[PDB]
Design a protein around this ligand. Structure first.
Ligand SMILES: N[C@@H](CCC(=O)N[C@@H](CS)C(=O)NCC(=O)O)C(=O)O
Ligand SMILES: [Br-]
Ligand SMILES: [Br-]
Ligand SMILES: [Br-]
Length: 210
C-alpha cells in the first residue's frame, strides 16, 4: 500500500470534523495535520486556493491527488465507503439533513465568532428565532426516518454531519437542545453507540474552541 491520506486544517473541528469522523468510522488511518495560527501564513501560499481543509490522497499507484471543499471531500469519501445512501430515497434524506444542518452550522458559527461581549444577545435571538425553526426541521427530518439514523439503518454522512452540527449547538447554546429538542439530544447520545471507532475517537480527541 503506497496508500496514504493526509488532512490539512487548523487546530479546530469546524469544517474538517465531518471528514475526520467519516475516515474514523470507515476505519481509514490518516495523518491528521492540524497546524497553528502562527504556521498558517507560510503554509497558505503553497496550497491550492490558499484555504483548508485539504485532503491529500496518495493512491495505490503512488500518485497524489489533492482535494478541496470540506463537504465535496466528505461526499466523495462517503460514496466510496457506501455511506451516501443505498437508494435515491436514502440519498435525498442525507442531502436534506445536510442542507438543513449547513444552515444551522452557519448560525452557531456566527455566535462562536461574536465578541464576548455581544454573544448573549445573539444567543437569545437564536433561541427565539432561527434556532427553533431550523431545529424543528432537523427534528422532523430525523423523526421521519425513525430517530436513530437519517437514512437506512446504518451510519451515513448525514448522521455524522448531524452529529457534528448538534455538538456545535450543545457547546454554543448550552442546555437548549437538551431542553427544547430532546429527540435530537437522544440522537447525539445514541449515535456513537452505532460505531465503536467513533466513540473511542471522541473520547481521545483534543479539545478545541469550535
Ligand atoms: N466552504 C469551505 C470553507 C473553507 C474555509 O472556511 N476555510 C477557512 C478555515 S478557518 C480558511 O482556510 N481560512 C484561511 C484563510 O482563508 O487564509 C469548506 O467547507 O472547505
Ligand atoms: Br463532533
Ligand atoms: Br464538532
Ligand atoms: Br433552554
Amino acid at each position: 500500500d503506497k496508500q496514504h491520506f493526509k488532512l490539512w486544517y487548523f487546530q479546530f473541528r469546524g469544517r474538517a470534523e465531518p471528514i475526520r469522523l467519516l475516515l474514523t468510522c470507515a476505519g481509514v488511518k490518516f495523518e491528521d495535520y492540524q497546524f497553528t495560527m502562527d504556521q498558517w501564513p507560510t503554509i497558505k501560499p503553497t496550497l491550492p486556493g490558499g484555504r483548508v481543509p485539504l485532503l491529500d490522497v496518495t493512491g495505490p499507484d503512488g500518485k497524489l491527488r489533492r482535494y478541496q471543499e470540506s463537504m465535496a471531500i466528505a461526499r466523495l469519501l462517503a460514496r466510496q465507503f457506501k455511506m451516501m445512501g443505498e437508494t435515491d430515497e436514502e440519498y435525498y434524506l442525507i442531502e436534506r439533513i445536510i442542507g438543513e444542518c449547513e444552515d444551522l452550522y452557519r448560525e452557531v458559527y456566527t455566535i462562536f465568532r461574536t465578541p464576548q461581549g455581544e454573544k448573549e444577545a445573539k444567543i437569545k435571538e437564536f433561541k427565539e428565532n432561527n434556532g427553533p425553526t431550523l431545529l424543528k426541521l432537523v427534528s422532523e427530518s430525523l423523526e421521519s426516518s425513525g430517530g436513530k439514523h437519517v437514512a437506512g439503518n446504518r451510519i451515513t454522512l448525514g448522521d455524522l454531519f448531524l452529529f457534528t452540527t448538534l455538538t456545535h449547538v450543545m457547546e454554543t447554546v448550552p442546555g437548549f437542545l437538551e431542553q427544547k429538542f430532546p429527540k435530537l439530544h437522544e440522537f447525539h447520545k445514541s449515535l456513537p453507540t452505532s460505531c465503536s471507532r467513533l466513540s473511542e475517537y471522541l473520547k481521545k480527541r483534543a479539545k478545541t474552541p469550535f
